[PDB]
Design an enzyme around this catalytic site. Structure first.
Site, PDB file in Angstrom:
ATOM      1  N   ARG A  67      -3.208   4.580  -2.220  1.00  0.00           N
ATOM      2  CA  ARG A  67      -2.789   3.288  -1.690  1.00  0.00           C
ATOM      3  C   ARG A  67      -2.788   2.191  -2.751  1.00  0.00           C
ATOM      4  O   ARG A  67      -2.092   1.179  -2.517  1.00  0.00           O
ATOM      5  CB  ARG A  67      -3.702   2.895  -0.543  1.00  0.00           C
ATOM      6  CG  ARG A  67      -5.127   2.680  -0.965  1.00  0.00           C
ATOM      7  CD  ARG A  67      -6.125   2.612   0.214  1.00  0.00           C
ATOM      8  NE  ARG A  67      -5.758   1.702   1.234  1.00  0.00           N
ATOM      9  CZ  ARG A  67      -6.024   0.412   1.461  1.00  0.00           C
ATOM     10  NH1 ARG A  67      -6.762  -0.203   0.566  1.00  0.00           N
ATOM     11  NH2 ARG A  67      -5.525  -0.151   2.555  1.00  0.00           N
ATOM     12  N   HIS A  80       0.900  -1.184   0.000  1.00  0.00           N
ATOM     13  CA  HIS A  80       0.000   0.000   0.000  1.00  0.00           C
ATOM     14  C   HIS A  80       0.922   1.212   0.000  1.00  0.00           C
ATOM     15  O   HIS A  80       1.673   1.468   0.948  1.00  0.00           O
ATOM     16  CB  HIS A  80      -0.832   0.011   1.282  1.00  0.00           C
ATOM     17  CG  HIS A  80      -1.913  -1.044   1.249  1.00  0.00           C
ATOM     18  ND1 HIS A  80      -2.330  -1.680   2.397  1.00  0.00           N
ATOM     19  CD2 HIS A  80      -2.664  -1.516   0.231  1.00  0.00           C
ATOM     20  CE1 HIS A  80      -3.321  -2.545   2.035  1.00  0.00           C
ATOM     21  NE2 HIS A  80      -3.532  -2.432   0.732  1.00  0.00           N
ATOM     22  N   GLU A 129       1.856   4.035   2.812  1.00  0.00           N
ATOM     23  CA  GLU A 129       2.363   3.603   4.155  1.00  0.00           C
ATOM     24  C   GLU A 129       3.859   3.769   4.140  1.00  0.00           C
ATOM     25  O   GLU A 129       4.597   2.808   4.255  1.00  0.00           O
ATOM     26  CB  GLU A 129       1.904   2.157   4.385  1.00  0.00           C
ATOM     27  CG  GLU A 129       0.360   2.134   4.486  1.00  0.00           C
ATOM     28  CD  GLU A 129      -0.264   0.750   4.445  1.00  0.00           C
ATOM     29  OE1 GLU A 129       0.371  -0.315   4.559  1.00  0.00           O
ATOM     30  OE2 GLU A 129      -1.488   0.690   4.236  1.00  0.00           O
ATOM     31  N   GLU A 166       1.343  -4.383  11.187  1.00  0.00           N
ATOM     32  CA  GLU A 166       0.875  -3.014  10.949  1.00  0.00           C
ATOM     33  C   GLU A 166       1.661  -2.124  11.937  1.00  0.00           C
ATOM     34  O   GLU A 166       1.449  -2.254  13.133  1.00  0.00           O
ATOM     35  CB  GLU A 166      -0.637  -2.898  11.171  1.00  0.00           C
ATOM     36  CG  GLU A 166      -1.474  -3.606  10.088  1.00  0.00           C
ATOM     37  CD  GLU A 166      -1.704  -2.694   8.913  1.00  0.00           C
ATOM     38  OE1 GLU A 166      -1.270  -1.523   8.865  1.00  0.00           O
ATOM     39  OE2 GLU A 166      -2.314  -3.169   7.944  1.00  0.00           O
TER      40      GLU A 166
HETATM   41 ZN   LIG Z   1      -1.505  -1.556   4.253  1.00  0.00          ZN
END
Ligand SMILES: [Zn+2]
Length: 307
Positions: free
Chosen positions: A127, A69, A72, A270
């Site tokens: 993203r 993504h 990020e 994450e």
């Molecule tokens: Zn992500």
């Protein structure tokens, strides 16, 4: 800049700067790392993986991808720091040395290069990929909903304009199919780690189904141990669990696909933070994030070498 020792790890970089970094690292450590091109993106940019190895023939391997993504940005920045760290700690840290003396590591720092270039050029919060479909003027697919694991089931969108669009069919995005083909052809991956931000979570399968994986006890204990190691540096608190019980149903995700290929140690991180800055994490947090995340990843790799 001129050497990986003068590169500024405490700031965010462009695609060109990260691709130049990869060539510097290979030139400085040619006995340990090599740069592989596993495909080309939709807009024709090379897709590169760094292979870290001390020899052997198709040694058991660990996969790590970052930046699927594109917004990020802490993930690509962490991937550059990891690449350097591998070359610094081999021969200095006894535990990492033992891992690389027996296993190979494959590191994909910019898994979605076209989205990443777009976040610098046009829209910082983009993203998706940048593929175009003919039935829409909307662009791009969520590449972490495009994998062949419960593809098109609940927890992804069939609307091309959605931020969570799954694409026309599983593996439609060349950025995803390049990884799939590479991992299937290799056949000896033991761990598969996908790095995202934000929310401070360590997740294991599944996202697409309520069924519990057969290895839940072991993966839960490895996750507990990895979260404890990460927290030890700066106190950063992570939660852990399966994707569907910790967040929500999500289909077409990469670690669900890798676990169903028999890659038991399949986890998604994450990273920081929990929402104060979100995707726009200040550059002053890059090195602390990378350092703590390394302790979590090293804990998973140690478990893989011995199991
Ligand atoms: Zn992500």
């Amino acid at each position: 800049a001129r050497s990986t020792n003068t590169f500024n790890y405490a700031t965010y970089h462009t695609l060109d700067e990260i691709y130049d970094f990869m060539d510097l690292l290979v030139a400085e450590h040619p006995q340990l790392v090599s740069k592989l091109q596993i495909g080309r993106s939709y807009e024709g940019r090379p897709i590169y993986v760094l292979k870290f190895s001390t020899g052997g023939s198709n040694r058991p391997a660990i996969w790590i991808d970052l930046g699927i993504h594109s917004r990020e940005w802490i993930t690509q920045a962490t991937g550059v720091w990891f690449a350097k760290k591998f070359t610094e700690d081999y021969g200095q840290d006894p535990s990492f040395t033992a891992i690389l003396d027996s296993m190979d590591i494959f590191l994909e720092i910019v898994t979605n290069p076209d989205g990443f270039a777009f976040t610098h050029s046009q829209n910082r919060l983009w993203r998706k990929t940048r593929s175009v479909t003919s039935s829409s003027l909307c662009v791009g697919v969520d590449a972490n909903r495009n994998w062949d694991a419960g593809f098109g089931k609940a927890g992804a969108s069939s609307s091309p304009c959605s931020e969570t669009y799954h694409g026309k069919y599983a593996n439609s995005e060349v950025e995803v199919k390049s990884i799939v083909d590479f991992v299937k052809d290799h056949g000896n991956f033991k761990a598969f780690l996908s790095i995202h931000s934000y929310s401070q979570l360590l997740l294991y399968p599944y996202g697409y189904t309520t069924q519990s994986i057969p290895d839940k006890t072991e993966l839960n204990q490895v996750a507990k141990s990895a979260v404890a190691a990460l927290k030890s540096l700066y106190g950063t608190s992570y939660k852990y669990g399966s994707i569907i019980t910790t967040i929500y149903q999500a289909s077409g995700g990469s670690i669900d696909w890798s676990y169903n290929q028999g890659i038991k140690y399949s986890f998604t991180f994450e990273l920081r933070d929990t929402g104060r800055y979100g995707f726009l994490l200040p550059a002053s947090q890059i090195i602390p994030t990378a350092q703590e995340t390394w302790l979590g990843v090293l804990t998973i790799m140690e478990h893989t070498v011995n199991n």
